[PDB]
Design a protein around this ligand. Structure first.
Ligand SMILES: Cc1cn([C@H]2C[C@H](O)[C@@H](COP(=O)(O)OP(=O)(O)O)O2)c(=O)[nH]c1=O
Ligand SMILES: Cc1cn([C@H]2C[C@H](O)[C@@H](COP(=O)(O)OP(=O)(O)O)O2)c(=O)[nH]c1=O
Lengths: 137, 138
């Protein structure tokens, strides 16, 4: 099984006016929201991501259509489809992830605990594996 | 627009892999983000909203499809259509708004300066007007 990952369930307020989910920082997720970002209009043959973070905490949420997330740590690979706006996928440090099968109209929103910092990314898989092994085995 | 309202333009990092817009609190919007919420799956005939806030700062953003925002202060109305994920509509305190014409698959994201507080809502239009009149009138 897979360390440093959780699925977080949010409130979904649904009636004849539609659906509404609220997320309060440190309350419905464990961290303060310093930054958000969202991905839209990804062609269906694209795989995005391919990175890890040393310090950042993030929660991924698919608010329209569907997207699959491949999560890896050494010797373990999991795939989680996200297709319910009221479920968040929490990814801690040193998990490697990849996002693919973006459906038509898909919207991926990420909530993040720090401002964008290029030095906090690991983008080379061989460097990731090296660093992750020190933690995991 | 009106008083206390602005359209804000965000980075759209667009390439062969798609679009990505990042928003950092205090930086790309003028406040720190304590709460987000998002509305989805609204039927074509629904209007929602129907309120103002005294303290809350907010930024509205349509991430898919299209949705119209009706903004009111006393004796002035403007209608803004949201249809670009790279454009946010900032609404400050003492502005009444309603949301309507949510298209099929519309997603409306709201960034908010404070945690949900029902006492900061004004939900009755006449009360809204009485309070707002204080603010805006000579
Ligand atoms: C996530 C994010 C990316 N960017 C920029 C950094 C990169 O140059 C570019 C592409 O992001 P990248 O992290 O490579 O994409 P993904 O997670 O979708 O695979 O966007 C920001 O400026 N701010 C941000 O918050
Ligand atoms: C916005 C929001 C609403 N809610 C709850 C309380 C309200 O009764 C309901 C939201 O409806 P309301 O704000 O009245 O609707 P809209 O903005 O779409 O017109 O859900 C929260 O618990 N937290 C929140 O942040």
């Amino acid at each position: 099984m897979l360390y440093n990952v959780a699925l977080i369930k949010f409130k979904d307020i649904a009636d004849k006016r539609g659906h509404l989910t609220p997320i309060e920082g440190k309350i419905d997720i464990p961290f303060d929201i310093k930054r958000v970002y969202y991905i839209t209009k990804v062609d269906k043959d694209i795989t995005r991501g391919y990175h890890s973070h040393k310090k950042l905490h993030q929660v991924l949420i698919c608010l329209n259509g569907s997207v699959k997330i491949r999560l890896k740590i050494p010797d373990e690979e999991k795939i989680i489809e996200l297709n319910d706006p009221s479920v968040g996928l929490y990814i801690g440090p040193l998990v490697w992830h990849e996002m693919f099968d973006f459906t038509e109209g898909c919207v991926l929103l990420v909530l993040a605990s720090e401002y964008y910092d290029e030095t906090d990314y690991i983008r080379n898989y061989d460097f990731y594996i090296d660093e992750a092994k020190k933690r995991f085995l």
